[PDB]
From Swiss-Prot:
The chain holds residues 14 to 308 of 353 of the full protein. Changing residue 146 to F: Can increase the optimum pH. The gene is gpr4. It is found in: Cell membrane. Proton-sensing G-protein coupled receptor activated by extracellular pH, which is required to monitor pH changes and generate adaptive reactions. Activated by an optimal pH of 6.0-6.6, a more acidic pH compared to mammals. Ligand binding causes a conformation change that triggers signaling via guanine nucleotide-binding proteins (G proteins) and modulates the activity of downstream effectors, such as adenylate cyclase. Gpr4 is mainly coupled to G(s) G proteins and mediates activation of adenylate cyclase activity. The keyword Acetylation does not apply. Keywords: Cell membrane, Disulfide bond, G-protein coupled receptor, Glycoprotein, Membrane, Receptor, Transducer, Transmembrane, Transmembrane helix. Residues 144-156 are annotated as: Extracellular loop 2 (ECL2). GO terms for molecular function: G protein-coupled receptor activity. This is G-protein coupled receptor 4. Its main location: membrane. Changing residue 155 to K: Abolished activiation in response to pH changes.
Amino acid sequence: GLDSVLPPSLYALVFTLGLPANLLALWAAWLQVRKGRELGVYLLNLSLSDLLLICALPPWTDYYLRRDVWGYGPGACRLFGFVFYTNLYVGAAFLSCVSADRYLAVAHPLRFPGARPIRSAAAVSALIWMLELAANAPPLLGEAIHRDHTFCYESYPLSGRGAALANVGRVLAGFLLPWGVMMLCYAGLLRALRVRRLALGLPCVALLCYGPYHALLLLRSLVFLVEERLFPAYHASLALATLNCLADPALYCLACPGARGEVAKVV
């Protein structure tokens, strides 16, 4: 329906103008690590993930555009689910680490960050990917999604044992802990600094692109455990969880000098 219909037009306009921004973010994040900034590696990782997953649209926006619920038998849905799961969970983890890092810089005393150089940040960036890739699937039973206008990740078995309670787990572990840590970082930053506007754009951005998804999943899950027109809504929620990728490079590059640096780099 129409609540299905708008996402693909937003999609026509996200890949076109959201690849340059995430390329330039990587440029600036390197030229900060070459400067020794312990913070440029996080933006390197985040821009890598965003750049990888922006070229993965002509599968997903294709099937969500070619009216393909299962255009492939067993192969389409597994790939689509893996892509979306990893995309949004990586985005969340990178924003959360960026927030805790900037908190340590601005507000925290020398004690913790002075012993936090670039080698430490490379270690934690490896750990995040390792956890996200290795520990995602064993909590999916090894048979994650199956038969399914449904979008990518969508399916049609009754949730059962492998879908519902694990959805409650994924909502309360992919959203609440990251959101809580960003909020505690922001409130503590204010408790010290009363670079202060920026540092509260990330939690709001993460919410406005990954909050309705978690809440509407939670409702889908606690309705059952304890869907006619309620379904056109899940497409809009997925479009939010998509367009976060466009949102983030605009916020990160808010300080004006980076714009000139990148432009002079390219033009």
